[PDB]
Amino acid sequence: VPRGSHMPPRLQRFPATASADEIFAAFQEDGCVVIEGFISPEQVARFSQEVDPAMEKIPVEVTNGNSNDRTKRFSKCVIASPTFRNEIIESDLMHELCDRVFSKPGEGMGYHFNDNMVIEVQPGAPAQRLHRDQELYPWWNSMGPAGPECLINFFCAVTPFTEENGATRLVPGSHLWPEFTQINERDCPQFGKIETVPAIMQPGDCYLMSGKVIHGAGHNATTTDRRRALALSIIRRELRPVQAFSLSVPMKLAREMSERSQTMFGFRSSVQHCDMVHFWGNDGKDIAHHLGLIS
Amino acid sequence: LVPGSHMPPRLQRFPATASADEIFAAFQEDGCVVIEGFISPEQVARFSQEVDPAMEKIPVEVTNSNDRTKRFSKCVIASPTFRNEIIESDLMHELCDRVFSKPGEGMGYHFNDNMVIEVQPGAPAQRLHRDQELYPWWNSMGPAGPECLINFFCAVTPFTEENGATRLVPGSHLWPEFTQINERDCPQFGKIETVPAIMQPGDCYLMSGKVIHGAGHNATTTDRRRALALSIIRRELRPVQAFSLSVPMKLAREMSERSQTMFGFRSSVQHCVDMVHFWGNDGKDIAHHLGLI
Ligand SMILES: C=C1[C@@]2(C)C[C@H]3[C@]4(C)CC[C@@H](O)C(C)(C)[C@H]4CC[C@]3(C)[C@]1(C(=O)OC)C(=O)[C@@](C)(O)C2=O
Ligand SMILES: C=C1[C@@]2(C)C[C@H]3[C@]4(C)CC[C@@H](O)C(C)(C)[C@H]4CC[C@]3(C)[C@]1(C(=O)OC)C(=O)[C@@](C)(O)C2=O
Ligand SMILES: O=C(O)CCC(=O)C(=O)O
Ligand SMILES: O=C(O)CCC(=O)C(=O)O
Ligand SMILES: [Fe+3]
Ligand SMILES: [Fe+3]
């Protein structure tokens, strides 16, 4: 920023080799932070090829205002992609960051997966409605910035992110506004005056975003760029996933998963303390016994 | 009644033939209400007999809210009366919708648990607690918070003050600050007047996640005090039981669609301009992949 200019909201950046407490401090202060090279170079390539057939079989709606107008969405990444199920979801850093946002000492893994979405904003797609992802859990806004974190997003780029192909518009620091509202002219005072920043990103980068950060896919201005992303939506264990992964992901794949990844997809329980109780358990036991996964 | 005797809080009681609006009005005022005859005596007695082998095989722990209390949750597997008729209580669904379901979204609730709770002779009293402490952030929203959880807590065997009927605190869903009930955080600690849910078999009380309560002390030598807790949460919250993974598909196929939704064999659509199936499969109902039409 040239001297005397207005400084736009800060969007720090870290290489995927940086410390967890470091990237977390940026997450805490600004609600978001980029992690360049979150997934390896060829890894993202091997992922993008693997889901390209499934993407290719998704028609595009040309409608209207909603978040599906010229935007393809696809969630069966575990089924359709070995690289994702074998490599990406086993990022030690990802878990290291989920432990800081969600887990409490002695209570095990405090988080699990909400969704695994590939989102490909088609050329000419209108800008997505501005929103907090925690609107998925409607009461959460009511708790304001003091509320605990329900949701974080590792929002990784598949094809590159530019200002023109509709990369995500971020509003850093909107996690600390004093009243969390929906973002429209009737409910949001600051509507029309919201300073957004685009998340310019190369394939394999990601931004870790809080469910409190206002954001949205921008308008894709191009004519050939299908702007593709991979969203790793991770929630606290007490919240329900939008994807019923433990009913769609075949048991064969769950047997190949780690313990922690079995916990992420609901093939394994976790114990909550208050008295104690396995959430998503089976009459006082881990659901994994009944599924043939303890041995 | 009593003789200038201090009068205890009133737990309102309605027969199961009362209008769901009259029971919901009581529930809103007090946070709890008794539904007499929520289940028929014939239904209760078949249920109790159908789970009873499973109850006998459960070792009593003697030493914590599991102290001399049996807790059994495979009600759907062990009991046809449960899955074929207790689950199909229309008054239960009337009341659940009035609490949880939003306009134009389908069912906004599902099952958290189906727990048989048999308080043994001599079992000590349970700590005072709100059931929404299961979702730890919920107390922070206070009494203006939305409902997260309700309990249809049914007497399977009689509930008496001696054998440990639940102690309830009506209107504790309206206190300005929702706190955990200990000496550090709860200013009223020790000073809280509870009342027991005196119930006959098949009766039940409907209770908010926001009401303070605990199982009473079982001061008898003979009464094993058996209850059935139908714990119902809203659709965005995680169940304590993984029913869709343990309940067999053969039993899912025989369920009504609203029962399939209760146990996670079927999705429900939430609206935010946008629409998403909660607990879905790549934009489609999970009931498709499961073969439930
Ligand atoms: C761990 C416990 C938790 C936190 C949650 C409950 C809870 C899921 C709360 C909601 C209810 O609708 C119902 C009946 C389904 C219970 C069953 C018993 C447990 C699982 C619990 C327990 O089993 O304690 C050894 C408790 O007794 C208790 C009361 O103290 C708790 O509040
Ligand atoms: C219905 C929608 C909901 C309500 C919820 C999200 C949500 C599950 C929220 C949490 C995120 O981590 C992520 C990326 C996984 C998305 C995926 C897209 C949808 C499912 C949604 C959508 O697909 O719109 C027809 C939207 O785009 C949106 C933003 O507008 C919504 O708020
Ligand atoms: O497509 C994008 O860039 C953002 C996706 C998103 O924010 C959502 O669907 O919740
Ligand atoms: O068994 C009772 O009467 C009380 C049980 C209860 O409130 C609980 O475990 O949450
Ligand atoms: Fe979003
Ligand atoms: Fe309770």
Residue numbers in the entry:
A (entry chain B): -1 to 61, 63 to 273, 276 to 296
B (entry chain A): -2 to 0, 2 to 61, 65 to 273, 275 to 295
Which lines from the publication concern this structure?
AusE (Mr 35,100 protein, 314 amino acids) and PrhA (Mr 35,121 protein, 314 amino acids) are very similar (~78% amino acid sequence identity) αKG oxygenases that both accept preaustinoid A1 (5) as a substrate to form divergent products through dynamic skeletal rearrangement. Non-heme iron and α-ketoglutarate (αKG; also called 2-oxoglutarate)-dependent dioxygenases are widely distributed in nature, and play a major role in diversifying the molecular scaffold. AusE first desaturates at C1–C2 to form preaustinoid A2 (6), followed by rearrangement leading to the formation of the spiro-lactone in preaustinoid A3 (7).
To understand the structural basis for the expanded catalytic functions of the PrhA mutants, we also solved the X-ray crystal structures of PrhA-V150L/A232S mutant in complex with Fe(II), αKG, and its substrate (3, 5, 6, or 7) at 2.25–2.3 Å resolution, as well as PrhA-V150L/A232S/M241V mutant in complex with Fe(II), αKG, and 3 at 2.35 Å resolution. In the reaction of the PrhA mutants and 3, hydrogen atom abstraction occurs competitively at C-3 or C-5 to yield 4 or 8, respectively. In the complex structures of PrhA-V150L/A232S and PrhA-V150L/A232S/M241V with berkeleyone A, both H-3 and H-5 are well oriented to react with the reactive ferry intermediate.
